[PDB]
């Protein structure tokens, strides 16, 4: 739950800036793929 | 009594700004940049958030009677685009606002207004025609333009930017149908959870249902078969009967003859030689059981909508009255087994008989995007079946809008007259539409549609607006193109409904029973 | 209650239609416009007709229900051009206004019309044309030409030509070679909201909201091995397994009395679908509904079947088809099977509903024009505009005479009227000339609605007509300059405005009659 109030803040920065909501949701869509990427990279082997 | 008439002075203010209060919400909804809306309900607390004013206005309640007829003709819309069809609404909306304005100017009355759109939508159509490209001669180019066709029309709901990775489902979907118009042949399946690019196209039928005991959950080689028969009730008659016994060692007699009932139904059954079972309603246990001790597969609860599709994916049919086992047809295929997509597992099938329908599996990440892809799947394949019939097209994108500009205008120099006025004002209005396309990206609709409009006079076609980087470039290189048949019916309906507005004169409200 | 005497109820109750009549005098034309109208249940109809509005409309005097029991009488007698005709039905009462200020006794208001108006007849006589001496190629180019000014009239008229064939080719089909019957009754326009206005083509036949059941085989068959019609059929008894309906009771004594009645149905499942497929209806229309297991053998034996199909249509079919509806089981035969030529399901839009439809396109009993529209609110309109179409032609069967339009007629018989109100003298010369001078009010109303000088016009007509004696010259509704209507071919039935002329002055003579008003509840 934590992680919708974490987006609350970040977009009324942005919308401030004079920013159109659809490139503030294509930022974030293309900065999902990058942040599962960093999550991948830091993935450690486990056993079954 | 009670009744609350106005005469033409208030009946023809009061008209022309009902359509302009509500219509400014579909007017943010246009193009693949446009915006969407929320509604709440008063009950059950609900809300639907789409950029199709069909279920939007639907639901609005409306004391101006202007837009009644514009929600009527959205099922016209509903029937033909699906995508993007609030600018019929937004078109008519600028018709009746340009005349508002040239009445108070021109001051001409206003069944000379509408003469002149009727000349207006002429030139429009002659545009349209001669504008119009049929690639349907070459086969290899021909299902290329259809992903071109799908980018333009699969461009509706806030996922639009899936759009490449559902590209690939409606260009082998619309292969697979073959000339199917009917959603009915096309099966529609909603999943709750995953990654939103885990949508794919998959050959076969995904049934949500499950076995019930020991039906094994894999089945290879069976033999699909659809019954309407009744077997949960059982007994359940409906004659004019009543039952009188003596003692009740004829009153278990009764139901030995249930058994006898079912075991001779069950015999006739296994005369079929299938290994699959499936009934409109619920199976009772003890048929139940006599599946599983045969080796044949149990599915119930198979609603109206649900017993038509699986003979309809499979190319099964539905059959009825046993009694004749080799006179029907049945289903075949190649593996029946259970798989697991989202929390629910569904049944899996594969290899069926008929290719004639397809299986389009969508998983999303909200509740909001099952209705939202709903709607945007709502009309897919039907306007990519649309371009099988009717194969000219012809370039869209807020450039064929610019292009009957250039009709209208050169018409209006061979009419002139007084008429001309409200002629010129069609094309005003017209090339407003993609002004307003502008304004739904944040970009400048001053500059670039003054360039796009010089850049049609300068005898350029294929000119037009970029969405994505907010520039002229060509339609051709980016793919957007619509077919002849759509784009017909959005501009003449709207100019038909404008007619009709403009000839309220009155405004008569009765009182509420 | 309230009490009303003297010039109160004999004025203001007058005065009371006066200013609800002068509202649909906007509409007057073709250069009319519309209105919008809320039912009180909620729902919206917009019409310009007079007829429809003054229908569904809530009133408040009792003078209403006059102006609607007209009407009634209107559409059963001429009912052509309404939009039209409702106008000039409230211009006689108008002009009694001002005979009352004058001195003039209410009674011999109302009796001088009457003498004026038998007069006014014999005078729209001599100018009138007949059609019926011509051939019957010259008598549909004169339909062509009356389809164009009578047919049109409400919206939809951007486009004339595409109805213009639907109302001509209608009346061919149901006609008699020597130009005299009419039936309007067999001919029934069902439309639906789809597609474009120009679409319409025409289908003879009617359409059906149900399609075939079972969507376990083919949408439509267009051809038949047996020809021959495709051998319609209709049971007009319900389709079930048969079971007394009256109250009985079943005794069941042993298991095989039990297991009998479970072959029961069984022996008739196959008993019914044989006697059809003997008979090789293709076509069978079930009344109430069918039986469930019966769905598929339908199928099975290549037996097309609907459900809950209303008894109205039913009677259009077989008179479509030269055949007779299935009374009962026992009584199927091949001799009651109807002819039907080709027989589909309309695709619609995506899914919907689809429409089945019956057509026949050889000679048939029932026709029909294939009407579909994007707007809605159009199809109510637009149906009701060429359902007038039927009494229009009716007008040319029966009344041979036709004069032309235009309103030319009233500016015709209003120099004669003048004449013949100078040879009663006495006080009949002001009241005969009022009768003509509310007949001018009627040119006079059609140049208000195109922007022309009602007089300006008014006076070239009398001034042109006293040349000439030729009835062409006319008001011009839609500004196509010159007045002549010859070559406008701009025509109007002689029985048209002959009755709703007369029955409008028949009526308006016990209208001034009425002195004090007694309102009861209901």
Redesign the interface.
Known sequence: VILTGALLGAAERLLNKGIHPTIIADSFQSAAKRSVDILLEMCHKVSL | ?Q?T?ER?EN?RLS?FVGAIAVGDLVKSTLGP?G?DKLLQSASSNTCMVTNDGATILKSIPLDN?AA??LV??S??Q???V?DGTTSVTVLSAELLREAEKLIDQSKI???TIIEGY?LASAAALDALTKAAVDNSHDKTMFREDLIHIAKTTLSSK?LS?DKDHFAELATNAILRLKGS????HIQIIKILGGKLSDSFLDEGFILAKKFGNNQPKRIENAKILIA??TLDTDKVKI??????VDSTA?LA??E??ER??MKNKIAKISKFGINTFINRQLIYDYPEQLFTDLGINSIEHADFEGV?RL??VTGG?????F??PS??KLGECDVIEEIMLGEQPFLKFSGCKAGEACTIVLRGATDQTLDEAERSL??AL?VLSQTTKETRTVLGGGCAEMVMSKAVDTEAQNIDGKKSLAVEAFARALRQLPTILADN??FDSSELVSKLRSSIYNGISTSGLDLNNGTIADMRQLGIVESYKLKR?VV??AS??A??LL??????????? | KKRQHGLEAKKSHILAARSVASIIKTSLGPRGLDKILISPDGEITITNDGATILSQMELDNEIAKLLVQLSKSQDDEIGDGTTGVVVLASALLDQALELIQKGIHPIKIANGFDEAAKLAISKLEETCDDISASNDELFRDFLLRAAKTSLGSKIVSKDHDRFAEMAVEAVINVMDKDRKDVDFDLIKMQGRVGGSISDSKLINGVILDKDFSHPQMPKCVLPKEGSDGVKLAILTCPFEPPKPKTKHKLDISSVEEYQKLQTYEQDKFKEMIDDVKKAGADVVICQWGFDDEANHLLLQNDLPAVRWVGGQELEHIAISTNGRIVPRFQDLSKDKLGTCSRIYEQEFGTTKDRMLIIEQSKETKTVTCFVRGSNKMIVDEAERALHDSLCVVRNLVKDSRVVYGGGAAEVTMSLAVSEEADKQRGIDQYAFRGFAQALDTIPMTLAENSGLDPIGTLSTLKSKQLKEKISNIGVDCLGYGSNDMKELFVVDPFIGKKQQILLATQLCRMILKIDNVIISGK
């Open positions: 009594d009744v008439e033409a009946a008209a940049k915006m009677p009644k007829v009527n003709i099922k016209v509903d029937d033909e699906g009355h206003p069944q009727r806030i930017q118009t009917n959603l009915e309407n028969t004659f004019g009967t009543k039952f009188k004829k007699q009764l030995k003859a006898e009932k038509e003979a309809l049919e539905v059959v009825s009255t009694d004749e006179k029907c709502h009309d039907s990206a944040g019916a003449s309906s038909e409904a007619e009709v000839r309220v004169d009155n405004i008569i409200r009765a009182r509420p029973r």
